[PDB]
């Protein structure tokens, strides 16, 4: 019927903005480092991504053959998974939601907690310990940074009543909830930063580096689709942020000329900043050491979420401000 | 402070002075600005002396704990019967921390969340005693659990330690399965949790019957997780191997203090709420099977600590002669029978804490004790026929009364299994006591002096226990009360 | 939230007051109730001091052990107060003046 | 409930088209980690915690905030207790 | 009928946690997982009465299970750790210094 | 059984619990409340309402064979 | 029938974890279990009992029994048992739990034979619907705080235990510093 | 003071959570009271 | 006060509703009961549509579906 | 305009993000022949059944 | 979203009542009252089946007063409350012309 259609309109425009996601970052790291990204694989290099996407399929494969096929083989099916279904929930406008789930925080938080195992079965179905080692550190960092988002999320439900993103931006409609949490915002973007392994804490892509990775033994597809997931991931907490801190799909000042606009123009664009400071964060900064962002996750970002729970809580309980 | 936790100031103040101690501790063991001091002894004075303000806290506020009746009845409920039970308990705690400070620093046991875990335990029982629905049962069940499980671990590098804590873990964590899917029968054929209500639905109907089949399993798995927490032959396995891998502090407080709350417990949730004449067949086979099989086994032993568990196992079978039969006779005869057990273990572990020093391990270490420590060798005799049931001491007062109650019980085939396996049983603590008294050893093993703390404690235990007989008028008094005023 | 402040078992003495305010019953403390607070407060500074020794932190020891018994002292004097104020302790001086 | 179904669907189609991409070329020790899961376990409890009581703030009273703070206060005193003892380093 | 078939399936994972435990001889972490075996099954059954009887205890007490699970799993886990350590193996003969 | 609904409302037969629970505090003797209690286990299980229409059923089924 | 096929895979899934050859396995086929429990709570309607699960159980539990699993490289014929010799006993033990299931099934919970049209519905408590998760926290936090707070007792001992068994600090490793003066202030030098 | 001077420069984040933290429960604890008491 | 506003608005339609819910439900009601009475005939002693329950206190039959109104 | 050229990849994903939530809107509102709520409850299935019967009917 | 049967009767629905809701409120808060009192009262259905049939006769008169006292603002406000699943702050322009006409 037409829940189908509905999947399938989300799934393949999601595969293409991750194509094109890539595709931008690219472009904008070159145009930062004075250079210019790719630009001969069609015009500005919007064929870059088709290429790349032929180019792995038309590769011949290569079996590690690591007793181990089956779980070497799914767990980039899993985190594929995880992420399209992570996606299945957020919303664009005032209706478009495939499941309006009442708890669809905790559907997030959930979701994001099953991420972990994909990238630890793949370092341990690998035949190589330091792929193993790497995917243990990665799970832990996630797991780290997962409970400061989990923080964060409950200050957000601490904030708006309800738990279901559309409810959250309809509360949104009045201050859009950055402007009073600024700085748990700015918390929430670098955990989000390093629960995707993405900008600084970026251990898996420290490949040059002795950390290695979780990637080192996958294949072209196996590598591909821990890719697709990984940039679908981000796409998807760039989303969580605007939903969460900037409204989603509410203008600016509501002035009518700014009404004209559809909304999912407005969740686009502000998706889209998001992913620009993503890859300007990634750009601009250094990374940190595997034990350093451990420390600062564990010993920096938790404090400051449970104290910005706990005074969120007191100024909502305190004064009639609670809904 | 708001007037209703006027009924939970020892637990407060015990948990608070547990915060405090964890804190001080911590803050003053990772220090460099010394040089790393063992607070285990400063941390375990501090631990008595909050057990001390909190059991003069509980002593002094007797009518100021029934404050907030019905606000706090979801949770628990507190009476005569748990005041005395918690001054007992904290009577107890405070007696084997006490006579536990030697082993720590001589041991170089220096870890005060040793201290700490002695703290919030005892705070569990303490909730255990009063609780009086189907949660807080479970949740101060586990807390305990939990801090018994660490206890018996704490020793990380000794294979005993560890091994005992794994078998510790591994078989209290299906008791507790058991029991959980007792309470889940209970509630979903019952509709309710709440000690009350479980008394007003079963009142009136046996358990035996083809209704009430969920009640009925629910009731025995949950009679089977309370006698896996008294160590019931049945489900016993764990208390020797335990009581012998931990460290002997640890032993000496999971011997004394778990026994009088899970059996408080066990008289709120079972003689109160779900009395019926099933449950007293439990438990009678469970008293049959523990005296029998604990006197066997420990006429086999030849280490003091296994002994001393099996011990043990028998005189619980004993306190459940006393619930088995199940009238006001009955509890007030498990009532003596836990405070004489309870005195004559405190007793018996000082004396081996005392022994620990040149680290006792068989019978026959304690051989020709006669000769280089005399009053030592006569107070262990002493505790050795008081295990007995010899008349002039305390514990032949609880064994007399257990059979008096199990005479007017009509249980006569109870009285006979009962007496016979105290005649069997009686073989090895004369042994023990031919061991120091009797036998004239080639090489002998010197024991180093007690400690005061010890000794203070092994001197006043022993003074209760050999003149106890002068005068039971209080104890039995209390008891009495405390039958009664378990239904009113 | 709704709170019942009757206990199980009645008052065997003239009640001033059920539910007494915290502020009213630190100020129904009489001399013996600073006196129970200053013995508990002075027996855990000592038993504090005494017991750091060894450690070598006797400041701490004598801190740590006085936040205890201040805790512990000021819990029993005002349970022995409230105690007093809701008739469950002779308070004969309290009930004079309320008379 | 009602609105799961559409997630079941979306998670087949996922797999659909996972197992598609997969076979498009085929046409042609240390404790630290268990230090870290362990606080991860206990502060997956909080959060578990925290959502009912962030979601029913309006109803519960400064009852249940006092109760909540009182929660973290018992087990704010465990993360002081890791941040002492060096469990959060590494 | 749905009654019927959550408590046949609650009791069967109990049933197989058991058959776990007894089939795993040499196997101690598969007894452990047994255990939680258990657990889970006893959640579900709390959960499943809590809605067939329209009362919010099974909910509440099935919540506080989950946390007491994890508490006792942390600690277990702990408990192989060190064991595993102290041992160098997980194999049960090495288990066995008590007897 | 509390009163506690599985939605936020009255429990089921929480007024069949009040009704039982009444009976057994005003009561001389336990077996007064027999047809309370009998009440109150109906609500919780259904068993006497599903045994009548498992029999309807069955003389309904056996007329058709 | 969806209610079927999730306990039919929920009993695989616990049959694979019993009888798995490789605890890695075991703890996949956990965490499939757990899956099947939570796709059983969305179908009796406890959303947040079921996320939950998902959270802790799938994600908490589960990963330290992985991690801890993959850590200890279990070697097989370490752990390794014919199953043959225990098949009399697992059956005789599973048989007469069956039969007691049996019995209870028989007396109490009654199933009902073949209902719609016959559903009243009262439209009084459908004004403003509660949620599990708003009913689960107004409870537990206003009239039953006791209960909540008592395991944070039992995670507090549940850490101090962990802490007290698997610690182990470095002895002699040296640890970098941040709080340097060429971090803090840095004079700049030269040689003249 | 210097100590504790010293302690904010070491450490500022512990320093600004524990802040907030004060905050957070000041308010309910007295602005709160006297809140009500106002109305 | 916009959900204050909403539940307001069902509040006021809620008597009309209930009406033709409880008339729907009497009718069906009356149904099952010639049904159980043409098919229940035969057998004595069986009466028509007795209460297991005591005291009235009227309940809605029993569905034996598990939280049938959610779907 | 070389950044708006550096931007344009950006723009494709804004685009795609756009076609997924509009093309969900318009196939649910096609099936359904309203567009999707998203407040919707227990109260609001009944009545939405409700109303569909009673159209039924009336045609 | 048709509001209107074939020979001008008005469908009960739900789109029309969300609509009429504060006319149905002003007018006959009475026997409403009275009905959820019988209610309350006894939950059986059949015992007071007349308070739901007066409950009935308002609403439907009501909803045929109102019908033919505006008809386009009318049909206007059930079909954008039709169209928005009865959301009343998307239809704000429908229903201050269906206030205009009807005063409460
Ligand atoms: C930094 O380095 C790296 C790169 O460099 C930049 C890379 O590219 C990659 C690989 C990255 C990719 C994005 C390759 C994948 C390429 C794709 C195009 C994604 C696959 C997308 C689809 C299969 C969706 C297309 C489906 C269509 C068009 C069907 C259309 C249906 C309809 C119109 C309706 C029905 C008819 C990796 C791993 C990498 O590491
Ligand atoms: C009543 C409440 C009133 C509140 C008033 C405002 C107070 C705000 C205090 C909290 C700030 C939270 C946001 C900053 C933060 O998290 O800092 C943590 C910390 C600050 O401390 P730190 O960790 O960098 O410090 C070094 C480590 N110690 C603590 C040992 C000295 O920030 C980081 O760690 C930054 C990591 C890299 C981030 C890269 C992405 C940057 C993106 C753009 C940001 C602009
Ligand atoms: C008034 C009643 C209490 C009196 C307490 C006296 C001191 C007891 C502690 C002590 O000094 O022990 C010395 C002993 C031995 O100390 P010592 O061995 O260092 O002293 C001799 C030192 N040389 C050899 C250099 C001469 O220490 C201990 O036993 C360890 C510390 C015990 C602390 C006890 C604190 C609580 C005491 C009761 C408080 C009520």
Same mark, same amino acid.
């Given at each position: 019927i037409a829940v189908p259609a509905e999947i399938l309109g989300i799934i393949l425009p999601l595969l293409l903005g991750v194509a094109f996601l890539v595709l931008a970052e690219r472009k904008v790291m070159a145009f930062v480092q004075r250079r210019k990204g790719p630009d001969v694989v069609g015009s500005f290099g919007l064929l870059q991504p088709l290429a790349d996407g032929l180019k792995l399929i038309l590769k011949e494969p290569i079996s590690?053959?690591?007793?181990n096929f089956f779980l070497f083989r799914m767990a980039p099916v899993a985190t594929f998974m995880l992420s399209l279904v992570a996606w299945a =929930? =957020?919303?664009?406008?005032?209706?478009? =939601?495939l499941s309006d789930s009442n708890i669809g925080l905790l559907y997030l938080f959930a979701i994001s907690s099953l991420g972990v195992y994909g990238i630890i079965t793949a370092g341990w179905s690998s035949n190589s310990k330091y792929a193993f080692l790497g995917a243990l550190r990665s799970a832990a960092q996630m797991v780290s940074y997962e409970v400061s988002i989990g923080l964060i999320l409950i200050t957000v439900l601490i904030c708006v009543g309800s738990c279901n993103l559309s409810e959250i931006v309809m509360a949104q409609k009045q201050i859009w909830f950055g402007i009073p949490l600024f700085p748990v915002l700015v918390m929430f973007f670098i955990s989000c930063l390093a629960e995707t392994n993405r900008a600084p804490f970026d251990l898996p892509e420290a490949e040059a580096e002795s950390v290695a990775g979780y990637n080192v033994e996958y294949s072209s597809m196996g590598f591909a689709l821990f890719f697709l997931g990984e940039y679908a991931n981000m796409i998807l907490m760039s989303g969580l942020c605007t939903s969460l801190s900037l409204g989603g799909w509410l203008p600016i000042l509501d002035l009518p000329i700014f009404k004209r606009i559809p909304g999912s123009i407005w969740f686009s664009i502000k998706v889209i900043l998001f992913l620009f400071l993503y890859i300007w964060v990634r750009a601009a900064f250094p990374r940190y050491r595997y034990d350093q962002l451990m420390g600062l996750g564990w010993k920096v970002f938790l404090p400051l979420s449970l104290a910005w729970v706990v005074a969120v809580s007191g100024v909502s309980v305190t004064f009639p401000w609670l809904p | 402070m708001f007037n209703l936790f006027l009924a939970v100031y020892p637990e407060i103040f015990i948990i608070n002075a547990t915060f405090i101690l964890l804190i001080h501790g911590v803050v003053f063991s990772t220090? @460099? @600005?010394? !040089?790393? /001091? /063992?607070l285990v002894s400063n941390v375990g004075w501090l631990g008595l002396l909050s057990v001390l303000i909190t059991l003069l806290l509980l002593a002094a506020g007797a009518p100021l704990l029934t404050i907030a009746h019905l606000f706090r009845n979801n949770f628990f409920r507190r009476d005569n019967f748990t005041y005395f039970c918690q001054i007992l308990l904290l009577l107890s705690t405070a007696g084997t921390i006490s006579m536990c400070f030697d082993f720590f620093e001589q041991e170089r046991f220096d870890a005060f969340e040793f201290i700490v875990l002695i703290l919030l335990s005892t705070c569990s029982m303490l909730f255990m005693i009063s609780a009086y629905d189907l949660i807080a049962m479970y949740l101060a069940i586990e807390l305990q659990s939990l801090c018994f499980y660490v206890m018996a671990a704490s020793k990380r590098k000794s294979e005993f330690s560890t091994e005992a804590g794994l078998k510790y873990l591994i078989l209290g964590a299906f008791s507790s399965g058991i029991l959980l899917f007792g309470c889940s029968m209970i509630y979903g054929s019952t509709g309710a949790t709440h000690f009350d209500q479980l008394a007003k639905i079963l009142t009136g109907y046996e358990l035996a019957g083809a209704r009430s089949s969920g009640i009925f399993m629910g009731i025995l798995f949950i009679a089977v997780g309370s006698l896996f927490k008294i160590t019931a032959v049945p489900f016993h396995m764990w208390a020797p191997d335990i009581y012998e891998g931990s460290p002997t502090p640890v032993t000496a407080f999971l011997s004394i203090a778990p026994k009088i709350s899970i059996f408080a417990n066990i008289l709120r949730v079972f003689i109160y709420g779900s009395y019926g004449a099933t449950l007293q067949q439990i438990f009678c086979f469970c008293s049959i099977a523990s005296m029998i099989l604990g006197a066997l086994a420990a006429m086999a032993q030849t280490k003091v600590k296994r002994l001393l568990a099996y011990s043990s196992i028998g005189h619980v079978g004993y306190i459940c002669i006393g619930f088995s039969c199940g009238t006001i006779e009955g509890i007030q005869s498990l009532l003596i029978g836990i405070f004489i057990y309870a005195l004559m273990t405190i007793d018996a572990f000082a004396i081996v804490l005392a022994l620990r020093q040149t680290r006792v391990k068989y019978?026959? !270490?304690?051989?020709?004790?006669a000769k280089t420590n005399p009053i030592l060798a006569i107070t262990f005799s002493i505790t050795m026929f008081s295990y007995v049931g010899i008349p002039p001491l305390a514990g032949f007062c609880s064994k007399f009364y257990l059979f008096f109650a199990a005479l007017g019980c009509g249980a006569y085939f109870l009285a006979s299994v009962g007496v016979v396996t105290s005649v069997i049983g009686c073989f090895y603590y004369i042994r023990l006591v031919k061991r120091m008294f009797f036998d004239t050893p080639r090489t002998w093993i010197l024991y180093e002096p007690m400690d005061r703390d010890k000794s203070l404690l092994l001197a006043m235990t022993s003074s209760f226990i050999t003149l106890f007989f002068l005068y039971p008028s209080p104890l039995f008094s209390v008891t009495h009360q405390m039958a009664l005023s378990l239904y009113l | 939230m709704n709170t019942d402040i009757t206990a199980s078992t009645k008052p065997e003495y003239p009640v001033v007051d059920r539910n007494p305010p915290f502020t009213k019953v630190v100020g129904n403390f009489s001399t013996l109730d600073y006196l129970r607070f200053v013995t508990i407060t002075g027996v855990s500074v000592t038993v504090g001091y005494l017991s750091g020794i060894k450690p070598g932190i006797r400041g701490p020891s004598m801190v740590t052990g006085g936040l205890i018994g201040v805790m512990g002292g000021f819990m029993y004097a005002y349970q022995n107060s409230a105690g007093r104020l809701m008739g469950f302790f002779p308070n004969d001086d309290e009930v004079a003046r309320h008379n | 409930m009602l609105e799961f179904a559409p997630i079941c669907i979306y998670l087949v189609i996922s797999l659909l088209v996972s197992l598609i991409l997969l076979g498009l070329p085929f046409l042609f020790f240390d404790i630290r980690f268990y230090l870290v899961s362990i606080l991860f376990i206990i502060f997956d409890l909080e959060v578990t915690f925290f959502f009912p009581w962030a979601v029913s703030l309006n109803k519960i009273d400064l009852f249940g905030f006092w109760s909540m703070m009182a929660f973290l206060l018992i087990l704010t005193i465990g993360f002081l207790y890791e941040w002492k003892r060096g469990a959060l380093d590494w | 009928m749905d009654l019927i078939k959550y408590f046949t399936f609650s009791m069967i994972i109990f049933i197989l946690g058991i058959w776990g435990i007894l089939l795993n001889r040499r196997n101690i972490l598969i007894m452990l997982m047994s255990i939680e075996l258990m657990l889970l099954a006893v959640n579900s059954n709390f959960l499943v009465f809590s809605v067939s009887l329209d009362d919010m205890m099974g909910q509440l007490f099935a919540l506080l299970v989950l946390t007491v699970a994890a508490a006792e799993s942390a600690i277990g886990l702990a408990i192989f750790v060190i064991t595993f350590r102290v041992r160098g193996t997980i194999a049960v003969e090495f288990i066995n210094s008590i007897q | 059984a509390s009163g506690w609904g599985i939605t936020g409302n009255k429990g089921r037969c929480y007024d069949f619990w009040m009704d039982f629970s009444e009976c057994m505090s005003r009561c001389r003797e336990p077996k007064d409340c027999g047809l309370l209690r009998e009440d109150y286990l109906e609500c919780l299980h259904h068993s006497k309402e599903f045994q009548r229409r498992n029999r309807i059923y069955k003389e309904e089924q056996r007329k058709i064979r | 029938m969806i209610l079927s096929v999730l306990f039919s895979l929920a009993l695989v899934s616990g049959l694979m974890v019993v009888r798995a050859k490789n605890p890695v396995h075991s703890v996949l086929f956990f965490i499939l279990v757990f899956c099947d429990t939570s796709g059983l709570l969305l179908l009796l309607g406890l959303d947040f009992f079921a996320m939950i699960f998902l959270v802790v159980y799938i994600g908490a539990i589960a990963v330290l029994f992985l991690f801890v699993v993959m850590m200890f490289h279990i070697q097989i014929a370490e752990i390794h048992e014919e199953v043959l010799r225990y098949l009399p006993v697992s059956g005789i033990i599973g048989l007469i739990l069956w039969w007691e299931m049996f019995f209870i099934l028989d007396n109490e919970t009654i199933p009902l034979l073949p209902t719609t049209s016959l559903i009243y519905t009262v439209y009084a408590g459908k004004v403003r619907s509660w949620t599990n998760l708003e009913t689960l926290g107004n409870l537990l936090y206003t009239y039953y705080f006791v209960w909540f707070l008592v395991p944070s007792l039992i995670l507090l001992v549940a850490m101090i235990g962990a802490i007290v068994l698997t610690m182990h600090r470095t002895t002699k490793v040296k640890r970098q510093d941040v709080f340097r003066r060429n971090a803090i202030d840095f004079r700049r030098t030269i040689m003249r | 003071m210097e100590k504790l001077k010293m302690f904010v420069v070491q450490e500022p984040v512990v320093a600004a959570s524990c802040l907030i933290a004060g905050f957070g429960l000041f308010l309910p604890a007295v602005v709160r009271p006297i809140l009500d008491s106002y109305q | 006060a916009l959900k204050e506003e909403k539940y307001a608005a069902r509040r006021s339609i809620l008597p009309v509703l209930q009406a033709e819910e409880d008339e729907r439900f009497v009718r069906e009601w009356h149904k099952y009961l010639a049904y159980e009475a043409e098919v229940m005939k035969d057998v004595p002693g069986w009466k028509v549509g007795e209460s297991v329950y005591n005291s009235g206190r009227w309940v809605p039959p029993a569905s034996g579906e598990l939280r049938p109104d959610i779907w | 305009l070389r950044w708006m050229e550096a931007v344009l990849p950006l723009g494709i994903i804004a685009g795609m993000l756009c076609v997924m939530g509009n093309a969900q809107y318009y196939i649910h509102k096609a099936a359904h022949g309203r567009p999707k709520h998203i407040g919707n409850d227990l109260w609001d299935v009944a009545m939405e059944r409700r109303d569909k019967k009673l159209h039924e009917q009336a045609a | 979203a048709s509001a209107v049967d074939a020979s001008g009767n008005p469908i009960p629905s739900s789109s029309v009542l969300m609509a009429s809701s504060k006319h149905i409120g002003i007018r006959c808060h009475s026997e409403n009252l009275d009905f959820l009192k019988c209610k309350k009262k006894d939950p059986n259905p059949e015992k007071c089946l007349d308070k739901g049939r007066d409950v009935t006769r308002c609403v439907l008169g009501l909803l045929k007063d109102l019908h033919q006292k505006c008809t386009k603002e009318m049909d206007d406000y059930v079909g954008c409350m039709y169209y928005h699943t009865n959301e009343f702050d998307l239809c704000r322009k429908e229903q201050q012309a269906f206030e205009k006409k009807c005063s409460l």
């Open positions: 590690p053959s690591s007793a =929930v =957020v919303p664009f406008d005032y209706g478009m =939601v | 220090s @460099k @600005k010394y !040089d790393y /001091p /063992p019978i026959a !270490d304690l051989g020709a004790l | - | - | - | - | - | - | - | - | -």
